Design a protein around this ligand. Structure first.
Ligand SMILES: OCCc1ccc(F)cc1
Ligand SMILES: [Cl-]
Ligand SMILES: [Cl-]
Length: 162
């Protein structure tokens, strides 16, 4: 198991513009296109990211290219964050995948407000951080996914991904 397969399991893969769980236009492997509700805005963003007139559809290779850049941007976002960096580096390799996942899903922003969780994770209080992480909108709106990430943080193994 690695970050890619993990994320691929959590986000799925779609080659046509779709609405995410929050109703926003997205494509590929969880690549958000825009928060605006104009489909045309979305198609525009799509062409811009892909470099060609897509007309709302892309190929698998194109989706995977987006995915790569997006994984990369997330890590890098983590590393550049002063509140994030230190926690991230204190964790083992599996748990670091759980961190990337959350970031990928919610932005460096969203995560940066999980202050108590961050601290608990940094002190390695697994069970405590798991309970704390559950007390969030994130868990409440996408519980099945959240559960898997949480378990990952809690255990440091890929069991939830089986
Ligand atoms: O709860 C967020 C857990 C987390 C830890 C480190 C990091 F870089 C990003 C997210
Ligand atoms: Cl791009
Ligand atoms: Cl879910």
């Amino acid at each position: 198991m690695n970050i890619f397969e993990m994320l691929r399991i959590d986000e799925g893969l779609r080659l046509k513009i779709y609405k995410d769980t929050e109703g926003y236009y997205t494509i590929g492997i969880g690549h958000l296109l825009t928060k605006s509700p104009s489909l045309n805005a979305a198609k525009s963003e799509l062409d811009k990211a892909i470099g060609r007139n897509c007309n709302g559809v892309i190929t698998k290779d194109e989706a995977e290219k987006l995915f790569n850049q997006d994984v990369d941007a997330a890590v890098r976002g983590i590393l550049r964050n002063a509140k994030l960096k230190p926690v991230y580096d204190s964790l083992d390799a599996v748990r670091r995948c759980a961190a990337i996942n959350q970031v990928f899903q919610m932005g460096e922003t969203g995560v940066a407000g999980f202050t108590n969780s961050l601290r608990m994770l940094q002190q390695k209080r697994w069970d405590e951080a798991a309970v704390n992480l559950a007390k969030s909108r994130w868990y409440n709106q996408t519980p099945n996914r959240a559960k898997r990430v949480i378990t990952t943080f809690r255990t440091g193994t890929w069991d939830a991904y089986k």
